[PDB]
Amino acid sequence: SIDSAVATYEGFSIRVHKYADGDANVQKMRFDLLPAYVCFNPHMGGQFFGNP
Amino acid sequence: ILAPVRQRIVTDLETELAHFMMNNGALSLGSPNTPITKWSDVAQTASFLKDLGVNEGENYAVMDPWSAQRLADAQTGLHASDQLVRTAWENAQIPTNFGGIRALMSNGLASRTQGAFGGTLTVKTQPTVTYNAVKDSYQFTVTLTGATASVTGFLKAG
Amino acid sequence: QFSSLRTPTGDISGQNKNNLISGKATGRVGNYITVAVEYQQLEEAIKLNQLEEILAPVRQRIVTDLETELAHFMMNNGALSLGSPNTPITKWSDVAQTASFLKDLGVNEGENYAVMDPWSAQRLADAQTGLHASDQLVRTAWENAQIPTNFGGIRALMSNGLASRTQGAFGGTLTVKTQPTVTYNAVKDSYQFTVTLTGATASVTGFLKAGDQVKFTNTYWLQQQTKQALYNGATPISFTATVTADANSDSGGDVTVTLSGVPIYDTTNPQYNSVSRQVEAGDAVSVVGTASQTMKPNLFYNKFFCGLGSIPLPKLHSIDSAVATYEGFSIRVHKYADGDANVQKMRFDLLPAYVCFNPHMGGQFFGNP
Amino acid sequence: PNNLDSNVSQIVLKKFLPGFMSDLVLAKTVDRQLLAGEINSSTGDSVSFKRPH
Ligand SMILES: [Cl-]
C-alpha cells in the first residue's frame, strides 16, 4: 500500500518509497540499498605505508 | 533538488568498502606515520604478494592525490626514457603499471584513528590455532596482558 | 547536499531526516569606468591634426582598468592558500600542488587555471632546462624561455598585468575571542563571517589589510563529498580564509574582521560541514607572511569561481553617440559641447558586473620553503 | 533623490552551480562476478564457497 519505483545509477538499483502523513500534512520519501560483502582470504590484502 | 540523492548513496557505499577491507586484510608494510615517497614504497607491495605465493588475477594498490603527485615528481627525475618524463612534466601522470602492480589514485578513501595504548604487551594464555578451529573463518580470539590500568577504546578496529 | 543513516534493519523511527536548506550566490553592478576629454574650438582649427590617432589608446585604457579591478576582486574573495609569500615559485612541485589540491577537494567541472608574472615563469623555465631526458622539451626552454601549455597537470598562463598588495603591520600572538556562529543557516547566502581576535598590538591602523590570509591551525579542510579530513603526507591541511576589508586594532589589542570562506560545522545539518571541528574561543591563529611585505600574488582557480558581465548603456537624449566594441566589450561615446565656453567634450563609458560563485574554488599560491 | 527600488524584483534564476564530487575506484576493481544473484529468498542471509585442499 505504498507507492514505489526503481532506478539504476552506476549499475546499482535503488528502491524509492513515497508515503505521506495524514495528520501532519507532510510528504516523505526514502531511497535505500542493501550491499553484500565477502572476505575470501584475509591473507591476500592489507594496508601499506612508507619506509623511513 | 533531489538529483544529488543517488550519488550520496553510492558515495556512502564505497566508504564502507574502504572500512570493510581495512578491518579484514592482515598484511602490513612499513610504518604508519611515514608518507609514500620513493619508488620502492609502492614496489614492496607487488613483491610481498609474490613472495607469499599469490598468483591469480590482478593486484591493485590505491593511494591519495598527494602521494600520486610525489610519485610523479620522482618520475620527472628519471635519466633515460623521454616519453616517460614528458608525460609527468605536463600531466603529472604515472603509468598504468607502476612497480609491477596496477596503481590507482582515489580521493574518496576512508581514514581511521589509532586509539590509546601503552605498556609492554604479552599473551596471557596460549590460544587454540589449528586448522580445525579457524577452518571456517580465519579469525581467532586472543587475550593480551600488561596494558595500561583501565582505558576505554584501548584498541580500535583496524 | 544530503546524508544517510546505516541500520541493520532499516528502521529509522527515532531519527533525523535531511532538511532542505536553500542558499544562493549574488552578483552586483560596480562603478562606471569613464575616460573624458575636452579641447577648445580654436585648437580643433589650428592645432589638432590626426585627432583620430590622438585617441586610439582611449579604448584600451577602459579594458585595462577592467582587468586590474578584476584581479583585485578575485584576490579578495578566494579562500584557498598554498605555500607562503616568503618563498618564490621555483620547483615543479610548486605549480603542481595547486592542481592536486583542487582535485582532493573535489572540483570536477570545467577547467582549472594557474596564473603568474614574468619573473615566476622564468624561474620555471630554467627548472625545465635541467630535465635529464626529454630532448625537445629542454631545447625549447633554452632557446625561447617558454614552458608548455599544461604544466603540472593544470593549465598555466603568464600575464604582466596583475595587481599587487601590501600586508599591513601585524604582530603578537593571536587567538579567537568568542565562538563564531558558523552553521549553514548563518552563512548560506554569502559564505562570509565575522570573528573578533585577541592579543594584537596596542593601537595600529591597518593591522590587517584586504587580501591577507588568516589560518586556523587546528581546524582542517574536509573533502566536500566524502567528508574525511585532508592529509598532505604526514600533516593535516589547515583551514584558511581571506580578509575582505581593512581592519584596525583598538587599544587593548582586539581586532574585528570579516573573512571570506567559512568553517562550517553544524550539529543539526552535519551534511554541510566544511571542516573537521568547531572553532572554539581560545584557538590559535596566525597570518601567512611577513608584516610589511609587498608582492604580486599568483592566482589559481576553477572556471566557475568568479564571473564577469557588462550592461548595455542607453543613449542620453539630445546628445550624439555611437557604439564600438574592442576585445568583445561594448563602449558608448557621447560627443557634446558647451556653447558659451566654446569647448568640445567626449566621454567613453562601460559598466561591469561581478559574481563570486564559490569562495572555496580559488585562492593564492606561493612556493614551499 | 529618486527611489525606484519598488519598481523591480529580486530574481533568483533557475540554474544551479557546480557542486563537488568524488571518484569510485575500489568499487570497480573488486570481484563482482562470484557473489551476483547468489543470495535470494531460498538462501537465507548468507552463502559459502569452498577453500582449496
Ligand atoms: Cl645526469
User: Does D21 contact C at CB distance below 8 Å?
Assistant: yes
CA distance B77 to C369: 20
A14, A35, A48 ranked by CB distance to B6: nearest: A14
Q: Helix crossing, C135-144 with B82-91: angle to 10°?
A: 60
Q: How far is D24 from chain B (nearest CA, A)?
A: 7
CA distance C244 to C73: 10
Q: How far is D43 from chain C (nearest CA, A)?
A: 18
- Judge whether C26 and C354 are in contact, CB under 8 Å: no
Q: For the beta carbon of residue C192, count every other beta carbon within 10 angstroms.
A: 19
Report the residue of chain C nearest B70, measured CA to CA.
C93
Q: Which amino acid does the sequence have at C141?
A: A
Report the residue of chain B nearest C231, measured CA to CA.
B66
Q: For the beta carbon of residue C344, count every other beta carbon within 10 angstroms.
A: 15
**Quick one: chain C helix, strand, coil %, rounded to 5?**
20, 35, 45
Q: Which are the contacts of C112, defined by CB distance < 8 A and separation ≥ 6? A: C98, C99, C102, C154, C155, C300, C301, C302, C303
- Judge whether C165 and C292 are in contact, CB under 8 Å: no
A10, A38, A40 ranked by CB distance to D24: nearest: A10
- Judge whether B145 and B122 are in contact, CB under 8 Å: yes
Q: Which amino acid does the sequence have at C184?
A: Y
Resolution, given in Å to one decimal, reads 2.9
As beta bridge partners, residue C236 has C231
**What phi and psi, each to the nearest 5 degrees, are found at residue C240?**
-150, 145
How much distance in Å is there from the Cα of C3 to the middle of ligand 1? 53
Q: How far is D12 from chain A (nearest CA, A)?
A: 25
Touching subunits for chain B (3+ Cβ pairs under 8 A) = A, C, D
Residue C59, helix vs strand vs coil: helix
The C-alpha cell of B136 is what?
Answer: 571456517
Residue C230 gets which letter from DSSP?
-
Helix residue ranges per DSSP H, chain C: 41-46, 51-54, 57-77, 92-105, 118-128, 135-144, 184-187
Residue B141, helix vs strand vs coil: coil
Query: Which residues on chain D are in Cβ contact (under 8 Å) with A36?
Result: 35, 39
C358 to D17: CB separation less than 8 angstroms, yes or no:
yes
- Judge whether B148 and B108 are in contact, CB under 8 Å: no
How much distance in Å is there from the Cα of B83 to the middle of ligand 1? 17
D24, D27, D35 ranked by CB distance to A38: nearest: D35
Q: How far is C359 from chain D (nearest CA, A)?
A: 12
Q: How many helices (H) and strands (E) does chain B have?
A: 5, 5
D34 to A10: CB separation less than 8 angstroms, yes or no:
no
**Domain locations in chain C as residue ranges:** 1-78+303-357, 79-168+292-302+358-369, 169-291
DSSP string for C308-369: EEE-PPPPPTTSEEEEEESSS-EEEEEEEEETTTTEEEEEEEE-EEEEE--GGGEEEE----
CA distance B65 to B78: 21
Q: How many helices (H) and strands (E) does chain C have?
A: 7, 25
- Judge whether A14 and A31 are in contact, CB under 8 Å: yes
CA distance A36 to B110: 19
CA distance B14 to B107: 12
- Judge whether C182 and C162 are in contact, CB under 8 Å: no
The C-alpha cell of B96 is what?
Answer: 598504468
D24 to A40: CB separation less than 8 angstroms, yes or no:
no
How much distance in Å is there from the Cα of B109 to the middle of ligand 1? 38
The C-alpha cell of D7 is what?
Answer: 519598481
Q: Indicate the helix (H) or strand (E) that contains C186.
A: helix C184-187
Q: Which of C153, C197, C360 is nearest to C287 (CA)?
A: C197
How much distance in Å is there from the Cα of B75 to the middle of ligand 1? 14
C107 to D22: CB separation less than 8 angstroms, yes or no:
no
**Between A and D, how many CB-CB pairs are < 8 A?**
8
What's the distance, CA C13 to chain centroid? Answer: 46
CA distance C143 to A40: 59
Helix residue ranges per DSSP H, chain B: 4-22, 40-52, 65-75, 82-91, 131-134
B64 to C229: CB separation less than 8 angstroms, yes or no:
no
Query: Which residues on chain C are in Cβ contact (under 8 Å) with B9?
Result: 4
In C57-172, the DSSP E strands lie at: 80-82, 112-116, 150-151, 154-158, 165-166
Q: How far is A23 from chain D (nearest CA, A)?
A: 33
The C-alpha cell of C97 is what?
Answer: 600542488
CA distance C264 to C118: 38
B17 to D30: CB separation less than 8 angstroms, yes or no:
yes
C93, C132, C229 ranked by CB distance to B111: nearest: C229
Report the residue of chain A nearest D51, measured CA to CA.
A40
How much distance in Å is there from the Cα of C129 to the middle of ligand 1? 13
Q: Which of C152, A45, C203 is nearest to B62 (CA)?
A: A45
- Judge whether C338 and C345 are in contact, CB under 8 Å: yes
Measure the CA dihedral C323/C58/C27/C238, to 10°: 150
D19, D25, D30 ranked by CB distance to B106: nearest: D25
The C-alpha cell of B29 is what?
Answer: 608494510
Determination method here? cryo-EM
CA distance B3 to C169: 48
Chain C interface, mutation test: which of B67, B75, B76, B85, most C Cβ atoms within 10 Å? Answer: B76
Query: Which residues on chain A are in Cβ contact (under 8 Å) with D34?
Result: 38
In chain A, what is the straight-line distance between the N-terminal and C-terminal CA atoms, in Å? 62
Q: Which are the contacts of B13, defined by CB distance < 8 A and separation ≥ 6? A: A12, A33, A35, D27
CA distance B95 to B156: 36
CA distance B100 to A10: 29
How much distance in Å is there from the Cα of B71 to the middle of ligand 1? 19
Q: Helix crossing, C118-128 with C135-144: angle to 10°?
A: 140
- Judge whether C199 and C253 are in contact, CB under 8 Å: yes
